[PDB]
């Protein structure tokens, strides 16, 4: 009982350190308890943030520096 | 010798023997060599398309015939109305054939004589090696220098002939520049000198430029930039400078080990300004500037700085010293024993802004250099109050942006220039261009590294002025990372932390763009506000509240939809 | 069973919501005092202002700041007042006139 008080705690430090208090109520609104398979089930758990992030593959290919010098526009062209 | 301006009897023989016909072709040449009798010659018929007829098939076993090809129509060809003539019998495009065999017959000879310089595991001074070597020396020298004049004269035909852009362009679909480059081999300094002309002529046309790339021509013209001739080295230095506005031959010019030889005519000759200008060029690259430090003789170039006496130092010199200095390793050599006080003292007398753009180059760095910046701080200061235009005050601003010593006091340069309602006022919606107003952020950013100034900024309404800048700014990542990095310089000093979180809107602006596509804007923006979550605790409900709504923004939207 | 109900409840939640760098912040953050017997958090800016931070050298990707007027002004027109570097526009050496004309 006495560490999964204490990791208990630590779970509620986590929350209070990110979720606000309107939104951990809001959050428990939009809950349910299932016995079936006996879990959470939150409505709409798929779009949630860190979901979404695993979802964005956002490594992309940036280019060179903007800023390169190119000078072969002198050059002429025939006709 | 004796030939009156007739011209008949003297064609005839052009086209009844063999011996005779040089005898006719040099008799006609002394003519064509006077201008006076060239207009004569021309109204001559049967007399031109004698000398293109026989050229034609018979200058394969002749050479001293092949002296009537050119002598005669390089007479008529350097002047330009005749041209036309000259192409009427196509002559132009025998010189090319004659151009390339000769070549060819070169490279045979040069294949013979090396298989010849093989015995020489045994001297014996008779048929296996020595002496006969030594007659077929001598051959090849009595041919090669007459093949060569040849080649000289075809050529200037052909360069005359190359002042029409049409007949520029018939040469090179005929492979004229492999031609040029195989010449190039050649040691000859006339020939060389009408090579690299026609090079340089031809350089200016991108086609042309390509076809000398992938013939590898750098490494052709490194064994003659030290060389002893003189045009032939300006000549040279052209071409390269032509060259040098690709990117794949200024990298080629560094391998092949021009840098040395570039900075040696750097020193004290007539090529200064060529040399500097290909420097120039090559030094635009980032990872060839850390080489002009390594032996590169950059000393010599801050003597001709300093000794150059007029009120602009030339643009060449100075461009290519704002290059060099965008290097450490470079900064370190230039500001080695007393080289940044002689630069800043002159750029203070004489306002240069090209000086100070270079100043402001070499204050970039964050070595010993920086620190070397403290005698010079009140002398920014007192050009920075708005005297002398606007170049020269931009870049004394951004000279003293940079000093961010972090035990400078700015307190005492900051009362007597009286340089901070400039600074507010140069926050104006309309007062100056943009780029004063970031470098006056910049040094407002600066400033308030001092806790001494902090109250100054406080009392002079600064932060106000910078959030209407950040409202109007908006759309330049710039502006906001600066004024960003302007509030996060000032809230922890106690004093503008109050203006910051109390009284102004500062924070919603930053809760606003917390999460923004730009990763600099995200970092200042996160790092201040570390800073404002401890000194009020109503403000950390809003960082926690946003953020959350952020990070799940479409999780909260989906009740909506 | 209600508490350890209540615990993958919370589980639950902050798999979903909290993103896993700050989870780790705060983990690294936090002591437990067993005098008070709870958890403790730190301060951050009285933990970090020793390496305090160096100006963003671009936000635009250039060696120095660069505003969009300059950007605008350096693409058009040749004065060097809008660039740090490269203020030379050089030209190619136009051939020279070899032929007479009498």
Redesign the interface.
């Given at each position: 009982?006495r560490q999964?008080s204490?990791?208990?705690?630590?779970?509620?430090?986590?929350?209070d350190?990110?979720?606000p208090q309107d939104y951990q109520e809001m959050?428990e609104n939009y809950?349910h308890?299932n016995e079936d398979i006996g879990?959470?089930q939150?409505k709409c758990?798929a779009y949630?943030?860190?979901?979404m992030?695993k979802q964005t593959p956002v490594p992309d290919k940036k280019e060179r520096?903007?800023?390169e010098?190119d000078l072969s526009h002198?050059?002429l062209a025939y006709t | 010798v004796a030939n009156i301006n007739d011209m008949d009897e003297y064609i005839e023989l052009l086209y009844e023997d063999i011996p005779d016909k040089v005898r006719g072709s040099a008799l006609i040449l002394q003519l064509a060599r006077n201008?006076d009798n060239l207009e004569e010659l021309l109204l001559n018929e049967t007399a031109l398309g004698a000398l293109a007829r026989v050229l034609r098939e018979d200058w394969k076993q002749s050479v001293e015939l092949a002296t009537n090809i050119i002598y005669i129509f390089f007479c008529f060809?350097?002047?330009?109305h005749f041209?036309g003539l000259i192409t009427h019998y196509k002559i132009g495009a025998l010189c090319m054939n004659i151009i390339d065999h000769e070549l060819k017959r070169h490279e045979l000879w040069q294949e013979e004589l090396s298989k010849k310089k093989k015995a020489v595991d045994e001297d014996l001074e008779n048929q296996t090696l020595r002496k006969d070597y030594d007659k077929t020396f001598k051959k090849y020298q009595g041919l090669v220098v007459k093949q060569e004049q040849l080649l000289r004269v075809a050529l200037y035909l052909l360069?005359?002939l190359a002042?029409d852009t049409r007949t520029e362009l018939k040469m090179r679909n005929k492979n004229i520049v492999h031609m040029l480059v195989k010449a190039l081999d050649r040691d000859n300094f006339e020939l060389l000198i009408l090579v690299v002309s026609f090079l340089?002529?031809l350089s200016?046309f991108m086609e042309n430029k390509n076809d000398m790339v992938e013939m590898d021509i750098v490494e052709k013209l490194v064994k003659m930039i030290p060389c002893e001739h003189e045009d032939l080295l300006n000549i040279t230095l052209?071409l390269l400078?032509?060259l040098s506005?690709d990117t794949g031959l200024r990298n080629k010019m560094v391998q092949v080990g021009l840098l040395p030889k570039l900075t040696a005519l750097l020193g004290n000759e007539n090529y200064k300004q060529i040399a500097m200008?290909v420097l120039?060029?090559i030094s635009?690259d980032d990872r060839f500037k850390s080489m002009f430090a390594y032996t590169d003789c950059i000393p010599q170039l801050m003597k001709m700085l300093f000794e150059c006496s007029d009120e602009r130092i030339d643009?060449?010199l100075i461009?290519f010293c704002?290059?060099l200095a965008?290097n450490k390793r470079n900064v370190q050599l230039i500001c080695e024993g007393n080289g940044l006080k002689m630069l800043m003292k002159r750029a203070l007398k004489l306002k240069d802004?090209?000086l100070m753009?270079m100043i402001r180059?070499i204050s970039?760095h964050d070595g010993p250099t920086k620190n070397l910046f403290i005698d010079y701080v009140g002398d920014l200061a007192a050009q920075i109050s708005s005297d002398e235009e606007e170049?020269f005050v931009?870049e004394c601003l951004?000279t003293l942006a940079n000093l961010?010593i972090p035990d400078l006091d700015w307190e005492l340069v900051l009362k007597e220039y009286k340089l901070v309602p400039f600074l507010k006022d140069k926050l104006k919606p309309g007062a100056a261009?943009?780029?004063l107003?970031?470098?006056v952020v910049?040094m407002i950013?600066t400033v308030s590294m001092d806790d001494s100034c902090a109250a100054l900024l406080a009392k002079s309404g600064i932060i106000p002025a910078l959030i209407e800048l950040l409202n109007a700014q908006q759309?330049?990542?710039?502006?906001?990372?600066?004024i960003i990095?302007v509030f996060?310089q000032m809230?922890?000093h106690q004093a503008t932390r109050d203006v910051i979180i109390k009284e102004t809107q500062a924070p919603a602006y930053l809760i606003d763009l917390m999460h923004d596509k730009?990763n600099?804007?995200r970092?200042?923006c996160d790092?201040t506000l570390?800073?404002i979550?401890?000194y009020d605790e109503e403000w950390a409900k809003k960082i926690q509240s946003e953020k959350?709504r952020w990070?799940?923004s479409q999780?909260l939207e989906m009740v909506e939809s | 069973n209600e508490?350890?109900?209540?615990?993958?409840?919370?589980?639950?939640?902050?798999?979903?919501?909290?993103?896993?760098e700050?989870?780790n912040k705060?983990?690294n953050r936090?002591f437990?005092d067993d005098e008070e017997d709870?958890?403790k958090?730190h301060?951050?800016?009285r933990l970090?202002?020793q390496q305090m931070?160096?100006?963003?050298v671009?936000?635009?990707?250039?060696?120095?700041?660069?505003?969009?007027?300059?950007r605008m002004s350096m693409m058009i027109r040749p004065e060097?007042?809008?660039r740090?570097?490269?203020?030379?526009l050089?030209?190619?050496?136009?051939?020279s006139?070899?032929?007479?004309?009498?």
């Open positions: 009982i999964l204490r990791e208990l705690r630590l779970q509620m430090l986590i929350i350190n990110f979720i959050i809950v308890w879990e959470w939150l758990v949630t943030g860190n979901n992030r520096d903007p800023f010098v002198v050059y | 201008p060809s350097s002047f330009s041209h360069l005359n002042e340089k002529k200016i052209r400078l032509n506005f200008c120039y060029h635009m643009l060449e461009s704002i290059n965008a802004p090209l753009k180059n970039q170049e931009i951004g961010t261009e943009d780029d107003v970031l470098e910049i950013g759309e330049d990542d710039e502006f906001v990372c600066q990095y996060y809230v922890f730009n600099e804007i970092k200042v790092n570390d800073i979550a401890e959350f990070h799940n999780w | 508490l350890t109900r209540e615990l993958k409840l919370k589980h639950l939640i902050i798999e979903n919501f909290i993103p896993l700050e989870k705060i983990m936090s437990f709870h958890w958090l301060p951050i800016t970090e202002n931070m160096k100006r963003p671009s936000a635009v990707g250039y060696k120095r700041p660069l505003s969009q007027h300059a060097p007042r809008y740090a570097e490269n203020i030379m050089l030209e190619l050496d136009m051939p006139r070899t032929t007479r004309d009498y």
